[PDB]
């Protein structure tokens, strides 16, 4: 197997900045205690690609989570805040677009490479949070 464009995401990343994450979590429906503990976390994200399977691991003092998926193919995901969601992740012009559906609700998480950073934009009903990761 040769290189893939998505290899640009592969590596070990650490959170360096976060904006509006509490408001994003409020819009998602996260309860008070989870919002406070999750908002304190400074996760590391580990992204790897093996064939068609992309794996994203998140490790923090709050929770450790992992998803593996194939682009375009829906999967079950239990989120760090304990939502059971149906997820589909696709690549749109270099951006990983992750849609989560649950309880008649929907949120979109976009992950993109900007300069040497990995920028994560979380969007729910007009509320956006931007989380910036740098190489660990």
Binding-site residues: 131-133
Residue span binding ligand EHC (CB under 6 A) among the ranges 4-12, 22-30, 67-75, 87-95: 22-30
Binders in 43-62 for ligand EHC, by CB under 6 A: 43, 58, 60, 62
- Total of residues contacting ligand EHC (CB under 6 A): 18
Q: Nearer Cβ to ligand EHC, position 55 or 79?
A: 79
CB of 73 to ligand EHC, least distance (A): 18
At CA 64, angle to CA 27 and CA 109, rounded to 5? 40
How far apart are the C-alpha atoms of 6 and 113, rounded to whole Å?
10
Angstrom distances, CA of residue 36 to CA of 14, 49, 64, 111, 118 = 20, 32, 17, 24, 24
Q: Is 81 in the site for ligand EHC (CB under 6 A)?
A: yes
106, with CB counted inside 10 A (0-12, 13-18, 19+), is middle
Residue of 10, 41, 49, 132 that binds ligand EHC (CB under 6 A)? 41
């Amino acid at each position: 197997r040769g290189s893939h464009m998505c290899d640009a995401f592969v590596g070990t990343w650490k959170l360096v900045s976060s904006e509006n994450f509490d408001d994003y979590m409020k819009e998602v429906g996260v309860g008070f205690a989870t919002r406070k503990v999750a908002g304190m976390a400074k996760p590391n994200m580990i992204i790897s690609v093996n064939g068609d399977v992309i794996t994203i691991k998140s490790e923090s003092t709050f929770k450790n989570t992992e998803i593996s998926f194939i682009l375009g193919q829906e999967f079950d995901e239990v989120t760090a805040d304990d939502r059971k969601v149906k997820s589909t992740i696709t690549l749109d012009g270099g951006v990983l677009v992750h849609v989560q559906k649950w309880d008649g609700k929907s949120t979109t998480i976009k992950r993109k490479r900007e300069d040497d950073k990995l920028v994560v934009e979380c969007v729910m009903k007009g509320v956006t949070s931007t989380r910036v990761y740098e190489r660990a």
